[PDB]
Amino acid sequence: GSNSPQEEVELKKLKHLEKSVEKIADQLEELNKELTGIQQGFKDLQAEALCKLDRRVKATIEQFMKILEEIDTLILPENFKDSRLKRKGLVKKVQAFLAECDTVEQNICQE
Amino acid sequence: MSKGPAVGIDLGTTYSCVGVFQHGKVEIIANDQGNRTTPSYVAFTDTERLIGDAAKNQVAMNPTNTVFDAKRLIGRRFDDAVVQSDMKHWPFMVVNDAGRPKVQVEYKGETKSFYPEEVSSMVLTKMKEIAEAYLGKTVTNAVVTVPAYFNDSQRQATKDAGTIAGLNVLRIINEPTAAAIAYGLDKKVGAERNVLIFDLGGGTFDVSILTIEDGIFEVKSTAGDTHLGGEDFDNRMVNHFIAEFKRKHKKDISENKRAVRRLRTACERAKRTLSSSTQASIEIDSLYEGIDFYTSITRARFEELNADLFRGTLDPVEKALRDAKLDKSQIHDIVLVGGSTRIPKIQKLLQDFFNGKELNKSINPDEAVAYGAAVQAAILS
Numbered sequence: 001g002s003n004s005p006q007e008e009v010e011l012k013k014l015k016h017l018e019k020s021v022e023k024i025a026d027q028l029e030e031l032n033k034e035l036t037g038i039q040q041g042f043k044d045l046q047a048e049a050l051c052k053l054d055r056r057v058k059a060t061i062e063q064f065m066k067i068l069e070e071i072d073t074l075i076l077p078e079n080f081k082d083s084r085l086k087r088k089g090l091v092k093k094v095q096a097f098l099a100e101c102d103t104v105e106q107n108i109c110q111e
Numbered sequence: 112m113s114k115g116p117a118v119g120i121d122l123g124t125t126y127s128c129v130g131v132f133q134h135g136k137v138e139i140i141a142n143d144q145g146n147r148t149t150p151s152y153v154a155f156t157d158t159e160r161l162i163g164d165a166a167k168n169q170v171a172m173n174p175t176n177t178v179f180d181a182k183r184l185i186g187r188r189f190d191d192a193v194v195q196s197d198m199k200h201w202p203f204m205v206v207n208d209a210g211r212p213k214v215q216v217e218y219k220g221e222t223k224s225f226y227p228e229e230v231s232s233m234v235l236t237k238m239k240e241i242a243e244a245y246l247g248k249t250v251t252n253a254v255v256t257v258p259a260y261f262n263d264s265q266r267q268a269t270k271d272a273g274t275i276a277g278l279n280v281l282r283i284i285n286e287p288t289a290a291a292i293a294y295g296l297d298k299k300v301g302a303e304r305n306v307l308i309f310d311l312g313g314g315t316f317d318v319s320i321l322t323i324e325d326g327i328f329e330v331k332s333t334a335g336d337t338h339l340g341g342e343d344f345d346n347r348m349v350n351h352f353i354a355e356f357k358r359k360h361k362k363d364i365s366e367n368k369r370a371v372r373r374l375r376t377a378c379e380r381a382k383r384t385l386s387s388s389t390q391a392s393i394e395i396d397s398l399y400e401g402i403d404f405y406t407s408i409t410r411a412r413f414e415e416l417n418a419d420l421f422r423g424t425l426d427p428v429e430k431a432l433r434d435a436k437l438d439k440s441q442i443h444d445i446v447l448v449g450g451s452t453r454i455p456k457i458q459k460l461l462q463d464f465f466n467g468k469e470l471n472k473s474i475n476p477d478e479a480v481a482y483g484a485a486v487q488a489a490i491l492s
């Protein structure tokens with residue numbers, strides 16, 4: 001129980017990053033709904049619609065990558081246990097969303 | 112919007128800068144993203160054309176249709192050794208239209224080709240709009256810089272880029288001349304001043320020697336490397352860490368592009384820290400195969416990893432003094448230009464080469480050219 005005010009500053013940065021991750025995760029969810037929409041919604045139009053979703057998944061992957069890069073600027077002393085735990089969990093959350101992004105890429109613009 | 116003053120624009124290979132002389136001083140103008148320098152990048156998408164920061168930010172997403180390095184093509188013929196060698200690296204297409212190079216892209220779902228001066232005009236239009244947004248006034252008159260070695264076709268092509276952008280190009284001045292102007296080296300007492308300009312920025316390395324007599328510039332020699340900069344130094348720290356990760360975890364992170372990028376981005380930031388500190392730390396969580404990478408690097412190791420690249424900068428300096436028929440003792444002023452001149456080792460080697468002589472380095476190295484071009488624009492109009 002040695003929580004410092006200095007750690008509050010670091011936790012605040014991570015919280016903002018968590019909010020940015022949820023915004024990008026919502027865009028991924030909408031992309032998923034659109035994908036479901038195309039695959040069962042009445043040729044060359046389908047291909048154009050899926051490779052338009054491709055640009056959008058690529059944009060989603062890029063936003064998740066720029067979040068990781070911002071997280072990688074953090075230096076958290078070993079005694080900032082709460083901040084190190086929160087940073088570790090957010091990286092893992094982003095990495096699981098990237099694996100989902102990759103699955104969408106594995107299913108679209110294929111031959 | 113009322114009538115605005117004349118501006119100085121440094122049209123770089125990777126980044127451009129715009130300055131204005133007002134209230135007895137030059138102010139370097141920040142763009143819409145608050146950056147004092149703007150990427151010389153143009154992106155062509157399914158619905159829009161992006162310039163600057165907006166174009167650089169989606170390069171990963173749209174590599175084929177994101178044009179950069181138009182400065183390496185401007186005013187050249189298609190069969191130029193430079194055009195044939197440089198296009199090997201570029202992810203976008205460079206085609207031939209009657210002996211002239213043209214960048215071929217996908218714009219609004221249609222195949223389109225633009226001349227290098229048309230691409231530079233779009234960058235110049237952005238620099239003009241950046242100036243207009245800051246001053247809240249219309250901007251027409253401008254001085255644009257070019258490297259001293261640029262020929263007649265390269266110089267006219269840059270003037271055409273400014274004309275297509277709607278600018279009245281006052282003069283095309285040499286980048287080393289602009290840097291020398293920024294430091295007011297032409298207003299110093301004496302008969303004749305020999306100036307060496309050391310320019311290490313935006314992917315190229317340029318050494319120029321100039322002579323100033325009663326404020327008149329003469330280009331004595333030029334030497335350098337058209338492919339040398341921060342990216343090469345960054346590459347050396349990336350290899351160092353990849354090797355460290357192999358020794359500690361017996362895992363090769365090199366084929367995982369995302370892992371390499373996270374490490375590269377951390378290295379580019381660590382290199383900046385090492386210009387003001389003697390050590391930099393990096394903490395990357397779940398870098399590769401869920402393994403956390405927490406490490407550090409000292410300035411000494413960083414210098415050691417790049418020892419050849421840093422010492423190698425001196426050779427062009429030797430070549431320029433040889434062509435200019437001058438001894439190193441004959442050099443009156445040394446000017447440091449470009450972001451990588453911030454590196455203490457490069458500064459140490461250049462002061463040790465010129466026997467403890469002081470360097471002109473107080474003006475921001477990435478901004479010195481735009482600074483002098485702004486001084487020149489306020490005189491010309």
Ligand SMILES: CN1N=C(N)c2c[nH]c3ncnc1c23
Binds near residue numbers: 382383
């Ligand atoms: C501190 N700093 N800041 C920079 N903006 C920069 C660009 N290239 C550099 N090389 C070394 N050190 C740098 C830089």
